[PDB]
Swiss-Prot record, chain A:
Belongs to the ATPase alpha/beta chains family. Its main location: membrane. It is a peripheral membrane protein. V-ATPase is a heteromultimeric enzyme made up of two complexes: the ATP-hydrolytic V1 complex and the proton translocation V0 complex. The V1 complex consists of three catalytic AB heterodimers that form a heterohexamer, three peripheral stalks each consisting of EG heterodimers, one central rotor including subunits D and F, and the regulatory subunits C and H. The proton translocation complex V0 consists of the proton transport subunit a, a ring of proteolipid subunits c9c'', rotary subunit d, subunits e and f, and the accessory subunits ATP6AP1/Ac45 and ATP6AP2/PRR. Non-catalytic subunit of the V1 complex of vacuolar(H+)-ATPase (V-ATPase), a multisubunit enzyme composed of a peripheral complex (V1) that hydrolyzes ATP and a membrane integral complex (V0) that translocates protons. V-ATPase is responsible for acidifying and maintaining the pH of intracellular compartments and in some cell types, is targeted to the plasma membrane, where it is responsible for acidifying the extracellular environment. This is V-type proton ATPase subunit B, brain isoform. ATP binds at R362. The gene is Atp6v1b2. The lineage of its organism: Eukaryota, Metazoa, Chordata, Craniata, Vertebrata.
From Swiss-Prot, chain B:
Keywords: Acetylation, Cell membrane, Cytoplasmic vesicle, Hydrogen ion transport, Ion transport, Membrane, Phosphoprotein, Synapse, Transport. Belongs to the V-ATPase E subunit family. V-ATPase is a heteromultimeric enzyme made up of two complexes: the ATP-hydrolytic V1 complex and the proton translocation V0 complex. The V1 complex consists of three catalytic AB heterodimers that form a heterohexamer, three peripheral stalks each consisting of EG heterodimers, one central rotor including subunits D and F, and the regulatory subunits C and H. The proton translocation complex V0 consists of the proton transport subunit a, a ring of proteolipid subunits c9c'', rotary subunit d, subunits e and f, and the accessory subunits ATP6AP1/Ac45 and ATP6AP2/PRR. The gene is Atp6v1e1. It is found in: Apical cell membrane; Cytoplasmic vesicle, Secretory vesicle, Synaptic vesicle membrane; Cytoplasmic vesicle, Clathrin-coated vesicle membrane. This is V-type proton ATPase subunit E 1. It is a peripheral membrane protein. GO terms for molecular function: ATPase binding; proton-transporting ATPase activity, rotational mechanism. It comes from Mus musculus. GO terms for biological process: proton transmembrane transport; synaptic vesicle lumen acidification.
Swiss-Prot record, chain C:
GO terms for biological process: ATP metabolic process; cellular response to increased oxygen levels; intracellular iron ion homeostasis; synaptic vesicle lumen acidification. This is V-type proton ATPase catalytic subunit A. ATP binds at G234, A235, F236, G237, C238, G239, K240, T241. It is found in: Cytoplasm; Cytoplasm, Cytosol; Cytoplasmic vesicle, Secretory vesicle; Cytoplasmic vesicle, Clathrin-coated vesicle membrane. Disulfide bonds: none annotated. Its EC number is 7.1.2.2.
UniProtKB/Swiss-Prot annotation, chain D:
Disulfide bonds: none annotated. Residues 1-10, 19-30 have a biased composition (Polar residues). V-ATPase is a heteromultimeric enzyme made up of two complexes: the ATP-hydrolytic V1 complex and the proton translocation V0 complex. The V1 complex consists of three catalytic AB heterodimers that form a heterohexamer, three peripheral stalks each consisting of EG heterodimers, one central rotor including subunits D and F, and the regulatory subunits C and H. The proton translocation complex V0 consists of the proton transport subunit a, a ring of proteolipid subunits c9c'', rotary subunit d, subunits e and f, and the accessory subunits ATP6AP1/Ac45 and ATP6AP2/PRR. Subunit of the V1 complex of vacuolar(H+)-ATPase (V-ATPase), a multisubunit enzyme composed of a peripheral complex (V1) that hydrolyzes ATP and a membrane integral complex (V0) that translocates protons. V-ATPase is responsible for acidifying and maintaining the pH of intracellular compartments and in some cell types, is targeted to the plasma membrane, where it is responsible for acidifying the extracellular environment. This is V-type proton ATPase subunit G 2. It is found in: Melanosome; Cytoplasmic vesicle, Clathrin-coated vesicle membrane. It comes from the Eukaryota. Belongs to the V-ATPase G subunit family.
Length: 468, 169, 600, 57
């Protein structure tokens, strides 16, 4: 492959903010990586941006600070950024650029892969079949997450979305105990976490919690602190996703990708687009942003002939609780389903504050069924949703109508509302519930009514649990 | 119950920390092994430097690489002091190869004013007329480049294939 | 004449320093051969726009000099396979590569050069006869359902010189050769046509035949016409396959062409099984419909220009197979995805944002692709005729009917089948609104209806009036309590209910209620409305004359008749003869007449 | 007290495991280092110079 010596340049025809412009460059190449040596011996990486004739431009990752017009070395790698990927990197923590920070060694590469990856042939796609249990009752009981169902989570600043994600990570797993507990030991499940735009406190908390849980034999972590250069915030997702594609389609595993704080990701992309001297588009964001998020999210799913899969769970915030803002608009277009949180539930000291009224799920219809799970999920979830909706309406009714005008069924609706809230929604920081356990809790809740009010459940399945 | 679960949590965190330190120590030992291998490779190159028959051919190749890459009317070649006549013969035989391969007129000058440091195991550098564009073809740098380029194949040969690598691509 | 590439502001790059050549030409860059479009020229310079990624291209890499604009190959074998926007045979690419990810610059034709085909010429023309563009010249037996005719491309004529004898040949073998004035031309099984133009036709004939849809709902109500244009909103959970499958199985069209944008593999696999499952027994057998149809679609990761060119590739394929002398139906799904593709293209050209990023020529492009439609008289010796229909599914952002695109599409289209999620929540399928849906093609269909039925138009107008009046009266009966009103009004409400529960509904999981013949629907509606007419007249007369008959009396006396009206839908014409069904309905009508007479 | 016994035993277990792993890796690596070294040297000695493919006149 590469056998030619590496070239160095001492030419600096100018600078403009993060850019460095130079000339007399012999046959440069776009997206070519560059190393810079400062007068004080400091090293700084960068990427080529604009090429023309002999002139070339390079964006420095570490910012242009104290770059002399003469005493500067500029070394051209002669290739593009390549990820040294290996399966044994599980349990490690890297920064945005991939350099170790967990006091471990440089990744002894198993194979070098293109960071920009490659799109998947749409013919070679297998539809999701079965579901993954994430340990969160408030999500699992009423809203399944199939293998490869890109379900985002919408939140706002100040809510504990990060803590919810941490619990999801430290409690996730599979339901292969359905056939045999002894057969469950053949686990092939992994998690890759990508913390971006995360401040010191939350990054350190993620580190501490993951380190304490002890499940890092199946967790590979990427951390990008706020102080790091903005340009690395846009390369970190590529690194994490390249690792995920490798670990899935070459080692045949089931991988849960979590990316955090896509709003900072979008801010970083805005930064780069502004640095590129391009006119802004709608709401000051680049036009091509739809293509960008598409090439981020679309790389997740199943492939024919392989026993492996991806599930991707991005997290993002809503500026000023604006669902029509471009960031959720494009996310909702690209992805399937939506999960929300609601500020009042958090204000009432209810954790996790997951609102089931606006929760939506597409692939739930086939993510759940007989054989791989029980015959008692769709009916139970639909009954819970309808009963909660009528309970909310009845609580509203009682607000003004009066307690003296209530009926027995309406008292029953209030009781269902309060019990559902205090038991099913509220879980706690570490109370990991299984799917069957949450179903049993749901049945215990439904027991308050007679069988008449539970119309949504056919009598053949009522006979299973109702007479208890 | 709080005390008991605190004890359970403390014991579990102790297992997790001990297991991480074990894994990290194993990876450290492997890294030290690899660095020892690179050091042996360096000293093997240093031993192979001595033989003055293939070394002339190697220097001819290095000079040809520098000429073919820089591609400029004025060229300045720099090497170690003790190999001066050897590089002189190399450039003299190399100039016809350039003048036929590229079909250009170029002038080459050997920089006898400054010398490479004595610590350099062996190699050459070449500069333009204004000393602004440089390329180094040093043996140590070449070794580093090739080692980092073929690092995955080295392990793949040494420490056995990967059980879970069901498909290479 | 060599690479002078630049950097990018997005996923697209430019170059220059090349010979003079016409713009809108697709030229390939580099050894990996990335496709890009000539746009702007300044002297010897010429900017380009590659669609794939730009990473890794140096300055000076070769510029492959083509000589054509964006074009699509046309010919036999297109049916049965799947293609992207650039017309790349993805299944065959997977087979050849034995790899998962799309390789860059796959230089394989849409059709291979290794499969033989049976050819038969016109068997009437001889060497030396005169030919002109459009004149058929062969016929291919692709499969046992459709035969793919072969003609000369447009802008060709002269005296024949060579007619191949029939046999097994591939596309690389020249089959026809002729001598024009001063030159001579050779033609093979495949022809290439520029995307950015319209194929010529002798004229256009006004559309006058109703498009056949299996479901009696949205056919007897708000009919579509073959060769028309229509809009159907579509969203998650409301159902788009409920119409795609219906037009793929229960319709008179000869070919379906499904164009997609931003889709998943679910639809591809489900439809590739739906073709061998939900099948037509035209010859008495079950057969895959994939051999009849062709699927084209892209996903969100694909290049934006490819996403924009996918619809054009679809419609030019549609026009080619419409020139054949057939009926084609184009499902142009996700006009919203098309619109965002256009916005993404315009974003990099620094065009003025007119309305929410949309270019000024959005309405122009909208009108221009909806223009390419209708029943037409094709160019050829034997006077070929056929039609191409388009169905453009709208996708409002959260149901807001205020998009520039949606408003313009509403302006252009003629039929509209409003779709709801509330009805699917109410457990009523199929989901039609019956109030915001409309049809404007009734005036043309008057001739056909008068020629065949002579009752559908009065009966439909009566049904519409009754439904609207019931919707008006729903509020008054809400303020009265739905327990007291005039008998005439009550009976009006009752027949509106009747029409709701036994006429305006159809079950897709019941084998015998997946297809309602149009004559069966007409007979049902006539029977119901005659029953209502007689009841209304009886009550109105007896109100003033003697013994005012109330609906309680009517319903109790005639409860068996309401049972028979409800059970009229269980006829299953698949197993039960047409004449038998007519005799049964006529006997029911006579029984109703005698029952009414005994009442009064 | 049981916890003290258990953590002592587990520390012994992990120490034994890492010792066995490093010993096995050394026994494996000391077998064929020379051959791979000679392969890498054999590539290093080669040069095969040539012009950039993109150049022309």
């Amino acid at each position: 492959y590469l056998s030619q010596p590496r070239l160095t340049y001492k030419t600096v025809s100018g600078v403009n903010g993060p850019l460095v412009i130079l000339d007399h460059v012999k046959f440069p190449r776009y997206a070519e990586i560059v190393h810079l040596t400062l007068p004080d011996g400091t090293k700084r990486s960068g990427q080529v941006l604009e090429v023309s004739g002999s002139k070339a431009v390079v964006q420095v990752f570490e910012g242009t600070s104290g770059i002399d017009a003469k005493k500067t070395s500029c070394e051209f790698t002669g290739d593009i950024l390549r990820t040294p990927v290996s399966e044994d990197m599980l349990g490690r923590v890297f920064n945005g650029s991939g350099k170790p920070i967990d006091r471990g060694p440089v990744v002894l590469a198993e194979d070098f892969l293109d960071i920009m990856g490659q799109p998947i042939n749409p013919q070679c796609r297998i539809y999701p079949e079965e579901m993954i249990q994430t340990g969160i009752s408030a999500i699992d009981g009423m809203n399944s997450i199939a293998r490869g169902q890109k379900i985002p989570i919408f939140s706002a600043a100040g809510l504990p979305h990060n803590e919810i994600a941490a619990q999801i990570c430290r409690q996730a797993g599979l339901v292969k105990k359905s056939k045999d507990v002894v057969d469950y030991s053949e686990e092939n499940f992994a998690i890759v976490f990508a913390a971006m735009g995360v401040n010191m406190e939350t990054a350190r908390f993620f580190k501490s919690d993951f380190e304490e849980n002890g499940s890092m034999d199946n967790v590979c972590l990427f951390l990008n602190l706020a102080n790091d250069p903005t340009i690395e915030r846009i390369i970190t997702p590529r690194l994490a996703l390249t690792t995920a594609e490798f670990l899935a389609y070459q080692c045949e595993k089931h991988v849960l990708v979590i990316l955090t704080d896509m709003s900072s990701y979008a801010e970083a992309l805005r930064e780069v687009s502004a640095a590129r001297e391009e006119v802004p588009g709608r709401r000051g964001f680049p036009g091509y942003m739809y293509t960008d998020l598409a090439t981020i999210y679309e790389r997740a799913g199943r492939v024919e002939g392989r026993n492996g899969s991806i599930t991707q769970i991005p997290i993002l915030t809503m500026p000023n609780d604006d669902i029509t803002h471009p960031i959720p608009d494009l996310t909702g277009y690209i992805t399937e389903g939506q999960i929300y949180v609601d500020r009042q539930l958090h204000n009432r000291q209810i954790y996790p504050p997951i609102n089931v009224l606006p929760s939506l799920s597409r692939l739930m219809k086939s993510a759940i069924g007989e054989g791989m799970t029980r015959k008692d999920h769709a009916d139970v979830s639909n009954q819970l949703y309808a009963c909660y909706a009528i309970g909310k309406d009845v609580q509203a009714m009682k607000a003004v109508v009066g307690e003296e005008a209530l009926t027995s069924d309406d008292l029953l609706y209030l009781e269902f509302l309060q019990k559902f809230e205090k038991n099913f929604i509220t879980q706690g920081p570490y109370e990991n519930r299984t799917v069957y356990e949450t179903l049993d809790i749901g049945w215990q809740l439904l027991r308050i009514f007679p069988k008449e009010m539970l119309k949504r459940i056919p009598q053949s399945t009522l006979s299973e649990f109702y007479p208890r | 119950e709080k005390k008991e679960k605190q004890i359970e949590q403390q014991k579990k965190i102790q297992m997790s920390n001990l297991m991480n330190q074990a894994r990290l120590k194993v990876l450290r030992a492997r890294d030290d092994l690899i660095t020892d291998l690179l050091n042996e490779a360096k000293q093997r190159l240093s031993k192979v430097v001595k033989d003055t028959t293939r070394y002339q051919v190697l220097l001819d190749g290095l000079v040809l690489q520098g000429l073919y890459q820089l591609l400029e009317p004025r060229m300045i070649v720099r090497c170690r002091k003790q190999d001066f006549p050897l590089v002189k013969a190399a450039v003299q035989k190399a100039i016809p190869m350039y003048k036929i391969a590229t079909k250009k007129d170029v002038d080459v000058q050997i920089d006898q004013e400054a010398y490479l440091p004595e610590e350099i195991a062996g190699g050459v550098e070449i500069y333009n007329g204004d000393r602004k564009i440089k390329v180094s073809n040093t043996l140590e740098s070449r070794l580093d480049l090739i080692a980092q380029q073929m690092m995955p194949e080295v392990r793949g040969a040494l420490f056995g294939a990967n059980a879970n690598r069901k498909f290479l691509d | 004449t060599f690479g002078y590439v630049h950097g990018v502001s997005g996923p697209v790059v430019t170059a220059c320093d090349m010979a003079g050549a016409a713009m809108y030409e697709l030229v390939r860059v580099g050894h990996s051969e990335l496709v890009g479009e000539i746009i702007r020229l300044e002297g010897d310079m010429a900017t380009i726009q590659v669609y794939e990624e730009t990473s890794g291209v140096s300055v000076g890499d070769p510029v492959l000099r083509t000589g054509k604009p964006l074009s699509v190959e046309l010919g036999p074998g297109i049916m049965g396979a799947i293609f992207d926007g650039i017309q790349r045979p993805l299944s065959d690419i997977s087979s050849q590569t034995q790899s998962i990810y799309i390789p860059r610059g796959v230089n394989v034709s849409a059709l291979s050069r290794d499969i033989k085909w049976e050819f038969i010429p016109s068997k009437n023309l001889r060497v030396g006869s005169h030919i002109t563009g459009g004149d058929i010249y062969g016929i291919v037996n692709e499969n046992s359902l459709i035969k793919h005719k072969i003609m000369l491309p447009p802008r060709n004529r002269g005296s024949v010189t060579y007619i191949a004898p029939p046999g097994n040949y591939d596309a690389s073998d020249v089959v026809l050769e002729l001598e024009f004035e001063g030159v001579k031309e050779k033609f093979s099984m495949v022809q290439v046509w520029p995307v950015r133009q319209v194929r010529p036709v002798t004229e256009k004939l006004p559309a006058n035949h109703p498009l056949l849809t299996g479901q009696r709902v949205l056919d007897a109500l708000f009919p579509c016409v073959q060769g028309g244009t229509t809009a159907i909103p579509g969203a998650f959970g409301c159902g788009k396959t409920v119409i795609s499958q219906s037009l793929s199985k229960y319709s008179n069209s000869d070919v379906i062409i499904y164009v997609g944008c931003g889709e998943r593999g679910n639809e591809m696999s489900e439809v590739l099984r739906d073709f061998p499952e939900l099948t037509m027994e035209v010859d008495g057998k079950v057969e895959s419909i994939m051999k009849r149809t062709a699927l084209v679609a892209n996903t969100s990761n694909m290049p934006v220009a490819a996403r924009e060119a996918s619809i054009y590739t679809g419609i030019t394929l549609s026009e080619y197979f419409r020139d054949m002398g057939y009926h084609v139906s184009m499902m142009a799904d996700s006009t919203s995805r098309w619109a965002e593709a256009l916005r993404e293209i315009s974003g990099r050209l620094a065009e003025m944002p007119a309305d929410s990023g949309y270019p000024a020529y959005l309405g122009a492009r909208l009108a221009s692709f909806y223009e390419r439609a209708g029943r037409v008289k094709c160019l050829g010796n034997p006077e070929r005729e056929g039609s191409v229909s388009i169905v453009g599914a709208v996708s409002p952002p959260g149901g807001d009917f205020s998009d520039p695109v949606t408003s313009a599409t509403l302006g252009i289209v003629q039929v509209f089948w409003g779709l709801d999620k509330k009805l699917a929540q109410r457990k009523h399928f199929p989901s039609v609104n019956w109030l915001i849906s409309y049809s404007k093609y009734m005036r043309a269909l008057d001739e056909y209806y008068d020629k065949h039925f002579t009752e559908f138009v009065p009966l439909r107008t009566k049904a519409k009036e009754i439904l609207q009046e019931e919707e008006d009266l729903a509020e008054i009966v809400q303020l009265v309590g739905k327990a007291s009103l005039a008998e005439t009004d009550k009976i009006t409400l009752e027949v509106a209910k009747l029409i709701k529960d036994d006429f305006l509904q159809q079950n897709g999981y019941t084998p015998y209620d997946r297809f309602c013949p149009f004559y069966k629907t007409v007979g049902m509606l006539s029977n119901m409305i005659s029953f209502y007419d007689m009841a209304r007249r009886a009550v109105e007369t007896t109100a003033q004359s003697d013994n005012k008959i109330t609906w309680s009396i009517i319903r109790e006396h005639m409860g068996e008749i309401l049972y028979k009206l409800s059970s009229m839908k269980f006829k299953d014409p698949v197993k039960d003869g047409e004449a038998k069904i007519k005799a049964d309905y006529a006997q029911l009508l006579e029984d109703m007449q005698n029952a009414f007479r005994s009442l009064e | 007290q049981a916890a003290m016994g258990s953590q002592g035993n587990l520390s012994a277990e992990v120490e034994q495991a890492t010792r066995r792993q490093v010993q096995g890796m050394q026994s494996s690596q000391q077998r064929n280092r020379e051959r791979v070294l000679a392969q890498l040297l054999g590539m290093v000695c080669e040069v095969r110079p040539q012009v950039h493919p993109n150049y022309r006149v």
